[PDB]
From a paper:
Here, we perform structural and biochemical characterization of the [name] effector [name], demonstrating that it is a Ser/Thr kinase. Together with two upstream genes, [name] constitutes the tripartite [name] TA. Notably, the toxin [name] (HipTLp) and the antitoxin Lpg2369 (HipSLp) correspond to the C-terminus and N-terminus of HipA from HipBA TA, respectively. Structural analysis reveals that HipSLp binding induces a loop-to-helix shift in the P-loop of HipTLp, leading to the blockage of ATP binding and inhibition of the kinase activity.
In this work, we find that [name] in fact shares sequence identity with the C-terminus of the E. coli K-12 HipA, the toxin of type II TA system HipBA, which is then confirmed by experimental validation and determining the crystal structure of autophosphorylated [name] (pLpg2370). Like other members of the protein kinase superfamily, [name] has a globular kinase fold that can be further divided into N-lobe and C-lobe. The N-lobe, which contains the P-loop, is composed of sheets β1–5 sandwiched by helices α1 and α2, whereas the C-lobe is predominantly α-helical and consists of helix bundles α3–α6 and α8–α11 and a short β-sheet β6–8. In agreement with our LC-MS/MS results, we can observe a phosphate group covalently attached to the Ser54 residue. However, unlike HipAEc and HipASo whose P-loops are disordered upon serine autophosphorylation, the electron density of the [name] P-loop is well defined in the present structure. One prominent difference is that the [name] P-loop with phosphorylated Ser54 is exposed to solvent in an orientation similar to that of unphosphorylated P-loop of HipAEc, which upon serine autophosphorylation rotates by ~180° and bends away from the N-terminal lobe by 17.3 Å. [name] and HipAEc superimpose with a relatively large root-mean-square deviation (RMSD) value of 3.846 Å over 221 Cα atoms. Conversely, the six C-terminal α-helices of [name] and HipAEc, including the catalytic residues and some ATP-binding residues, are almost perfectly aligned. A comparison of the crystal structure of pHipTLp and the structures deposited in the PDB revealed that the autophosphorylated P-loop in HipTLp adopts an orientation similar to that of the P-loop in the crystal structure of E. coli HipA S150A mutant.
Residue numbers in the entry: -4 to 311
Write the structure that this text describes.
C-alpha cells in the first residue's frame, strides 16, 4: 500500500502489535480504568460539521474546528458534549494536511524536552481518519474551571488579536502578572527555542495564557503546538511574533544572547544547560517522528526542517 505501516501507539508511540490500536500505558494515561478506546462514531466530515454547529457553546478559544468531549470510562469511548467537557477533539482539516497527526507528534516532542504538556494523542474515527485529542487543563471533572486568560486579554489587545504583537510584549505580560516571572522566563525560553526547531511559525499571542493554580499565576501548560510550516504550501516567516524586530533570519545570538540574556536575564549556566538538553534530545525526536502517524512525505518535511534549524543554532 502507499501508506507506510503505523506500528506504534497513537498516545505513547511505544511499539504495539498490529491487532492493537493503543498501548495499555496509553489507555491508562486517559484513565487507569480505561480498558479500550472505541473509534469516534463520526467521520472527519461529520466531526467538522458538528464542530461548526457547536461553536457557540465552545468555551475553549482557537480558530481551528474543535469539539468538547467527555471520556466514558466504563464504555470506553469519547462522547461529544457542550457542557463540562474534559477533552478537546480536533478533526482533520478540510484544507491543511495531517493537522491532527502533526499536532500530536509536536506536543509529544515538547513533552520529551520537559515542557508542561497535557495528556494528548490521536483517536481513530469512523472513516479511519485520526482525530487529535487533548485533556483540558483548566477543569477536572465537573468542578470549577481554573482562571485562564490569554495574552491578548492581558496585554490590552482586542480579542481577535493574534499576530500584531511581539515577543517583547509577551515578556512584559509575564513581568506584569506572573507570581515568579523568572521561573516563567525559563519556560518561555525553552518554548521559543522549541518552536524555532520544530517549524512552529504560529506561536501567536493567543497561544500564551496565564493560569491561576497552586497559589501562583504562571504560564499555562502547552496547547496548540504544531509544525505549522510543513502544514502549509508556502511560508515566508519563522516566527509568529517578532523577536528583536525580526520574524525571519533569526540567528543563534538573537536567541542565546539578546533573548536569553538581555531580555530574560538568564544566567549562562542555565542557558548552557538548556541548550545541551536540546542537543541531547534530537535523536529521540527524530526517532519519534519516524514512529509518528505523519505520512512519509510529512515526516521527511519535519526532519528536513528540524535539521536545518539545528544547524542554524550550531547543534552539531
Amino acid at each position: 500500500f502507499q501508506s507506510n505501516a503505523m506500528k506504534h501507539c497513537p498516545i505513547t508511540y511505544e511499539k504495539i502489535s498490529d491487532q492493537e490500536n493503543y498501548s495499555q500505558r496509553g489507555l491508562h494515561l486517559l484513565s487507569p480504568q480505561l480498558k479500550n478506546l472505541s473509534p469516534l462514531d463520526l467521520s472527519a466530515d461529520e466531526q467538522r460539521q458538528e464542530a461548526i454547529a457547536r461553536v457557540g457553546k465552545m468555551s475553549v478559544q482557537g480558530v481551528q474546528k474543535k469539539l468538547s468531549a467527555k471520556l466514558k470510562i466504563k464504555e470506553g469511548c469519547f462522547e461529544i458534549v457542550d457542557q463540562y467537557g474534559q477533552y478537546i477533539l480536533k478533526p482533520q482539516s478540510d484544507i491543511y494536511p495531517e493537522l491532527p497527526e502533526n499536532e500530536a507528534i509536536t506536543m509529544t516532542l515538547a513533552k520529551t524536552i520537559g515542557l508542561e504538556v497535557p495528556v494528548h494523542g490521536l483517536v481513530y474515527s469512523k472513516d479511519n481518519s485520526l482525530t487529535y485529542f487533548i485533556k483540558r487543563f483548566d477543569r477536572i471533572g465537573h468542578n470549577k474551571k481554573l482562571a485562564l486568560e490569554d495574552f491578548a486579554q492581558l496585554s490590552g489587545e482586542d480579542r481577535h488579536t493574534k499576530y500584531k504583537s511581539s515577543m517583547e510584549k509577551v515578556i512584559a505580560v509575564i513581568e506584569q502578572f506572573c507570581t515568579f516571572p523568572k521561573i516563567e522566563f525559563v519556560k518561555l525560553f525553552k518554548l521559543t527555542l522549541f518552536n524555532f526547531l520544530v517549524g512552529n511559525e504560529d506561536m501567536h499571542l493567543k497561544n500564551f495564557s496565564l493560569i491561576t493554580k497552586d497559589r501562583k499565576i504562571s504560564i499555562s501548560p502547552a496547547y496548540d503546538l504544531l509544525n505549522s510550516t510543513i502544514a502549509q504550501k508556502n511560508t515566508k516567516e519563522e516566527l509568529a511574533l517578532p523577536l528583536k524586530g525580526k520574524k525571519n533570519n533569526l540567528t543563534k545570538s538573537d536567541f542565546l544572547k539578546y533573548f536569553a540574556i538581555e531580555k530574560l536575564g538568564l544566567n549562562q549556566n542555565v542557558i548552557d544547560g538548556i541548550v545541551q538538553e536540546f542537543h541531547q534530545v534530537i535523536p529521540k525526536w527524530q526517532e519519534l517522528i519516524g514512529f509518528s502517524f505523519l505520512s512519509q512525505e510529512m515526516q521527511e518535511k519535519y526532519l528536513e526542517l528540524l535539521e536545518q534549524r539545528c544547524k542554524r543554532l550550531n547543534f552539531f
